Design a binder for this molecule. Structure first.
Ligand SMILES: Cc1cccc(C)c1-c1ccc(C(=O)O)s1
Ligand SMILES: [Zn+2]
Ligand SMILES: [Zn+2]
Length: 257
């Protein structure tokens, strides 16, 4: 069975969220593969199907539960289960399509969306950009209910799309970046719901390019600079892995050590 990590919005604390994101990172990778002091996710090539996914079970005050499936090779959400129904994003290729048949195998009802799970597609379906979608314990609670009620026709597609953007950022992007984990920790600490600032959105957008730049670096110096944003939206370039060691927690595997 794929490992299950449990999180609840009911009485969530800085501590419970900290333990959650550290457990997710611990199941995503062994941390045996480190490049320039940043851990690498397992190589898809050589990864047995029985190690391909982890399950994150989310519960809220209404004691509704949904289970997200994360791909350990990129930490991205590929689908979810709510009771007797499972839903999957459109796989990019045949290997990925066959992989998702190994998820939620006992579920009565299985559905694959025609659309992909990327931010550009989900923002379009939601009718809202990430910069206008609030994150925090309240938004996650509402997302869990929206995901749960999709199968009974209680959630419209735009609301589902928005709920996916919330879950992806507070789980996948938080696992990928200590910096985004810290943004979610602050929102919990101060009982705040608020949209992510440009620093967060640009890091999300740049994760694949940063993984490549770090792994292809000449002893930590980037072959080419990467442009990121500060909280105030001002742009700056990174030339070196060292400045990112407090920012990025996980990278997608790009090449052999
Ligand atoms: C120091 C760094 C390196 C790489 C990427 C980012 C987003 C950052 C920032 C941390 C705090 C910032 C601020 O207060 O605007 S920016
Ligand atoms: Zn409560
Ligand atoms: Zn190095």
């Amino acid at each position: 069975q794929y490992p299950i990590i449990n999180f609840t919005t009911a009485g969530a604390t800085v501590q419970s969220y900290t333990n959650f994101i550290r457990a997710v990172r611990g199941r995503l990778t062994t941390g045996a593969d480190v490049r320039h002091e940043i851990p690498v996710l397992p190589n898809r090539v050589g990864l047995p199907i029985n190690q391909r996914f982890i399950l994150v079970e989310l519960s809220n005050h209404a004691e509704l539960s949904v289970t997200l499936a994360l791909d350990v090779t990129n930490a991205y959400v590929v689908g979810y289960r709510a009771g007797n129904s499972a839903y999957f994003f459109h796989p990019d290729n045949q290997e990925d399509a066959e992989a998702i048949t190994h998820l939620f195998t006992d579920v009565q009802n299985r559905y694959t969306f025609a659309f992909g799970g990327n931010y550009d597609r989900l923002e379009q379906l939601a009718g809202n950009l990430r910069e206008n979608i609030e994150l925090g314990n309240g938004p996650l609670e509402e997302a869990i209910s929206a995901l749960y009620y999709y199968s009974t026709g209680g959630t419209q597609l735009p609301t589902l799309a928005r709920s996916f953007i919330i879950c992806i950022q507070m789980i996948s992007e938080a696992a990928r970046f200590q910096y985004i984990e810290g943004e979610m920790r602050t929102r919990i600490r101060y009982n705040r719901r608020s949209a992510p600032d440009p620093s967060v959105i640009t890091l999300e957008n740049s994760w694949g390019r940063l993984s490549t730049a770090i792994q292809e670096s000449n002893q930590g110096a980037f072959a080419s600079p990467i442009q990121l944003q500060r909280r105030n939206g001002s742009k700056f370039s990174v030339y070196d892995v060292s400045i990112l060691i407090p920012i990025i927690a996980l990278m997608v595997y790009r090449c052999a050590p």
